[PDB]
Structure formats: C-alpha cells, structure tokens
Amino acid sequence: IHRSQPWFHHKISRDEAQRLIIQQGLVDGVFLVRDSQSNPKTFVLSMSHGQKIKHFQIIPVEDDGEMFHTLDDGHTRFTDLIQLVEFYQLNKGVLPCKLKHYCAR
Amino acid sequence: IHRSQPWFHHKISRDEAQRLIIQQGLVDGVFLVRDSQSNPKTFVLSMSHGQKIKHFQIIPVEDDGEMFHTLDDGHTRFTDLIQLVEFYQLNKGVLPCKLKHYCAR
C-alpha cells in the first residue's frame, strides 16, 4: 500500500539513496523510504541530519497474533509504512529530527 | 473527516458516554471520541481503565503556521483525529493503556 506514496523509492540502492539525499544539500529532515537490500524483506528509512546520512531499519514485530512495523524495537508500533511515516513527519521519537522533506521519486 | 469513523460519537453527553462505557463492563481499553461540550470546539477521548472512566481533552496546538491535535500538551502531535486514534490504538503514550475496543455508534 505504501508503494503509491511519493516518499517510497522501490528498490533503489543505498548508494543511490545517499546520492539523492546528498544532492539536496544535506538539509535536516530530507528523507525517503526504500525496500531492504537484505532478506527477509524489511524496509529502510534514509534521512539526513547534522550533515550526515542515517539509515534506520524498519522491522516487523509480533504481538498477540498480529504483526507491526517499528524502528525502535517495538516501543512505537505501526500497522503499515504509511502510518509510520506520517507519524514521524510530525514527531521525531527516537529519530534525530522529524521527516520534513521527502525526495521526489 | 473523523465524523465517518465508527469510534466517533457526534455530540453525546459525558454522562451518555460514561453510560455506554460502563455498560461494556469497564474493560480496559474500551473507548470513544466525542465533540467537546465546551467552546471553542475541541474533542474528548473517553475510555475505561482500572474500573474507572477517564476523559482526555484533545486540543489544537500551533507551530509554524500549522495546527495539530494533541492530548499530551503537544509532545505527540497529529494532523487529525483519525491519525491520533489509530496511533493510540497501538501505542499507549501517556494514556493508562491502549485504545482497544471502541463503543458502537
């Protein structure tokens, strides 16, 4: 379902993701989400902050027969990537800063 | 937009909200959201926990020309009530427990 979102970049490499973020001038909050390069399939949040690029693995966690997505070891859970992104666009949580400007697909 | 959600009860009184929650057997997590009885219009989250009913005011807060909704003095912000509810259904935050079972409209 997240495949339709403008901030999701279907399977680009880490280097490619970094190139894009870097070419935005390393402004805090620039970001994008992409598919994991490793298997099983999880997801990765790539963003810039403090003139550096940070990657956060988005993993699936279970609880009472249900699976959720998280990037802070389950302390903050989400049903899908859309809910997770829109949450982090307004609240930084464990992130160095909020998700302010997504890279264009 | 939240007006369509099954957990939102358009303008019922506090007593009515408590009657409904109480008649569910005071199970932790039972809840509902309703319009504020006071003006200006804000919103109220009514839920049961520990055999008691708790009401949390959902207020609007501003930041950089934008308005958000919150129930913890802006520490956790949301664009609308739907995002706020779906977040609290999975994460308790400052609430005594998660929003588990909404009362039927």
- With CA atoms as reference, report the closest residue to B55 among B19, B25, B27, B18: B18
A37: left (phi over 0), alpha (psi -120 to 50) or beta: alpha
CB contact at 8 A, B30 and B47? yes
Asked if the C-beta of B28 comes within 8 angstroms of chain A's C-beta atoms, the answer is: no
Task: Tell me the CATH number for domain B1-105.
Answer: 3.30.505.10
- From first CA to last CA, the distance across chain B in angstroms is 16
- In chain B, which ranges are continuous DSSP H helix? 14-22, 81-88
Residue A85's nearest CA partner among A35, A33, A16 is: A33
Quote the crossing angle between the two packed helices A81-88 and B81-88, to the nearest 10°: 110
Mutate which: A63, A69, A85, A87, vs B, most B CBs within 10 A: A87
On whether the CB atoms of residues B44 and B13 are closer than 8 A, the answer is no
Q: How far is A86 from chain B (nearest CA, A)?
A: 8
Q: How far is CA A45 from the centre of its chain?
A: 2
| Buried-state track A45-71, b at ≥16 Cβ within 10 A, e below 16 | bbbbbeeebeebebbeeeeeeeebbbb
A105 Cβ contact list (under 8 Å, min separation 6): A6, A7, A8, A9
Q: Supply the DSSP symbol for B3.
A: G
What are the structure tokens assigned to B71, written together? 């129930």
Domain ranges of chain A: 1-105
Q: Residue A88 corresponds to which amino acid? A: Y
